[PDB]
């Protein structure tokens, strides 16, 4: 109980320090920025072939190959340019909540309620996709999954921890600690030196994969965090909550920077992604349509209406040439 | 023409499309059952062409993923679960030891299995009629 007083004496000190740098707000600093204007995008391609809800999706670094996982227990590697199917990987358990496509394109990972992250080998002999490894060690639903360039995978499970594995050996080499709830979101850095995880505590922490220390910790949300993504330069990130309030934080300022709220939506947010230049902040709400926000004005710039169910996944290619979304209607659509 | 190898690639895509449909038929001819009250445990048993797939399970975040299951089984709070915007349109089966069904367990295994099989049928009937423009 003695340490409780010290913790209170520390949290208030941190709160006061953050307020010291609070000299203005982005909504007032960039009032002279010309609005981007109405942005209209048409569904160029409509990939179909899934027979259940689509829970995850990831873009290959080449910006052409697209993976997707659904409740059918089948990953599909799409060719976005021609809508062709490159692979169809069957899964041992049809409970998948995430997927990742390796930066080099050799491997693809997935996982879910089985508490197992399976690494599949795409480019191999005999033209057959087989489970290269079966990572185990978590104690809860595997929430998110991302590949580091060195073929070492970072996972975030429902046991309130995030681990860094070694595909070659198959055992954890690091472990987040500090979250007080299920970790639902995870986002690497462009340089892969840092990453952030959002949990069911209205808190988003920052981690270092090199030595394993919690650098910052951002609060301000009122409910769980269901998605996170970095600004292209890697000095800021945006998170999506269940109270329909996307918030943009800054790493160097250690304080919330801007908020994107619209009372017309009362349902939560299920995906957040930035554009190549970082001016656009796409968001996938549960109202069955996306909302292409403005990263600097908090004013809507369009909507990607055209989904019959909620938008559960949302990703933007590396070159920014397209946007893909996958709703529970079992349909992926490439916008632009 | 406009395609040289893409014709071969398109042929491969059409072969994958078929495999999804053929295996997609098996999923349609199946009923998923969730039991409430490491990993996930699954129990598969056939019953007159119904390959019943009965599987058993912060804690409120696991309900979005299980939505769509045919029914929920209780073996023994129930009011709150029924009005969570997820299982509102899902039947609940309760064993003693949205059309809520209650049955007293019996020593014979066939009788218990018979009751649950019937409970799945009618809920399937209701879905069919609702999808047939009748109710």
């Amino acid at each position, epitope marked *: 109980d003695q340490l409780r007083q010290e913790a209170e004496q520390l949290k208030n000190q941190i709160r006061d320090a953050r307020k010291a740098c609070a000299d203005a707000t982005l909504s007032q600093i960039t009032n002279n920025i010309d609005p981007v204007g109405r942005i209209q995008m048409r569904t160029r391609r409509t990939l179909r072939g899934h027979l259940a809800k689509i829970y995850a999706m990831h873009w290959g670094t080449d910006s*052409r*190959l697209l993976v997707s996982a659904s409740q059918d227990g089948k990953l599909i590697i799409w*060719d976005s340019y021609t809508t*062709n199917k*490159v*692979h169809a990987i069957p899964l041992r358990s049809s409970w998948v909540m995430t997927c990742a496509y390796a930066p080099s*394109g050799n491997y693809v990972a997935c996982g879910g309620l089985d508490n197992i992250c399976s690494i599949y080998n795409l480019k191999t*002999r*005999e*033209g*057959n996709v087989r489970v290269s490894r079966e990572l185990a060690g978590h104690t809860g639903y595997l929430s998110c999954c991302r590949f580091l360039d060195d073929n070492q995978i970072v996972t975030s499970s429902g046991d309130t921890t995030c681990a860094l594995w070694d595909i070659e050996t198959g055992q954890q080499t690091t472990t987040f600690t500090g979250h007080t709830g299920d970790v639902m979101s995870l986002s690497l850095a462009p340089d892969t030196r840092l990453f952030v995880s959002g949990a069911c505590d209205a808190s988003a922490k920052l981690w270092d994969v090199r030595e394993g220390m919690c650098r910052q910790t951002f609060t301000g949300h009122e409910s769980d965090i269901n998605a996170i993504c970095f600004f292209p330069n890697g000095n800021a990130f945006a998170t999506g909550s269940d109270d329909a309030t996307c918030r943009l934080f800054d790493l160097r300022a250690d304080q919330e920077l801007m908020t994107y709220s619209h009372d017309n939506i009362i349902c939560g947010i299920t995906s957040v992604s930035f554009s190549k230049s970082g001016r656009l902040l796409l968001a996938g709400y549960d109202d069955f349509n996306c909302n292409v926000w403005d990263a600097l004005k908090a004013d809507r710039a369009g909507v990607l209406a055209g989904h019959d169910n909620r938008v559960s996944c949302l990703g933007v290619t590396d070159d920014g040439m397209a946007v893909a979304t996958g709703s529970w209607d079992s349909f992926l659509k490439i916008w632009n | 023409t*406009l395609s*040289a*190898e*893409d014709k*071969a*690639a398109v*042929e*491969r895509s*059409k*072969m994958i499309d078929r495999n999804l449909r053929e295996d997609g038929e098996k999923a349609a001819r199946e009923v998923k059952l969730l039991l409430l009250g490491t990993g996930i445990v699954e129990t598969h048993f056939t019953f007159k062409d119904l390959h019943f797939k009965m599987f058993d399970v912060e804690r409120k975040k696991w309900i979005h993923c299980f939505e769509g299951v045919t029914a929920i089984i209780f073996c023994v709070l129930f009011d709150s679960i029924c009005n969570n915007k997820w299982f509102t349109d899902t039947s609940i089966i309760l064993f003693l030891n949205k059309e809520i069904y209650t049955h007293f367990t019996c020593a014979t295994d066939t009788k218990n299995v018979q009751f649950v099989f019937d409970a799945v049928t009618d809920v399937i009937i209701k879905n069919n009629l609702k999808d047939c423009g009748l109710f």
Partner: single-chain antibody
Amino acid sequence: VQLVESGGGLVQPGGSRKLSCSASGFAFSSFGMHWVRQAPEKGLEWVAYISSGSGTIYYADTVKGRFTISRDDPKNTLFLQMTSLRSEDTAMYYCVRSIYYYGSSPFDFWGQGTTLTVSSSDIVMTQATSSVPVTPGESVSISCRSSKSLLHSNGNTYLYWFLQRPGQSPQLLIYRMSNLASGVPDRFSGSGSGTAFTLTISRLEAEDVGVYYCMQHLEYPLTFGAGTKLEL
């Protein structure tokens, strides 16, 4: 992974013969299959092709009608029913696999070969070169020419470079512009555009001696080059 075929031997001209290839170590049902003959002293020549799942079949003009190709996935066997043999049908027959999807490497693995002996216009590719004497350690460049432009509207230049070491089936080196095959040293490099193509070898080693063939996959029938050869 082996692709071994059996059959061959002397056959009365005008008769029929059956050539079978047994595939083990890889998923046969998911691969396309090609037949390529090689006359004793002329070079490689395309024969026939059967897609994955017997979707489509293509035959060379010189052997259209009297040749049939069949595929039996459950037993992993490829059959070439040969009918009305003639003097020029004699050749060393190879069985080649090729999987077609975005980013794949078709013609990667070649069979071993069965020797078949018979007792007594649209796309042309030329290699204006012959046996080039070369010593180890010096770079070598091999030229190639195409009647048509192999570049396509989608940006893929369908040229494949094969190497046939003495006494062994040809091995894939490069399948497109600078697209090295698996298990090939970095020394080899590919380049060129349009109808002009070149293959460069850096720090040539002893094992690199052989015959280099150029093939186009832009449109059937597939046609090989003159097979430039290297002398140590």
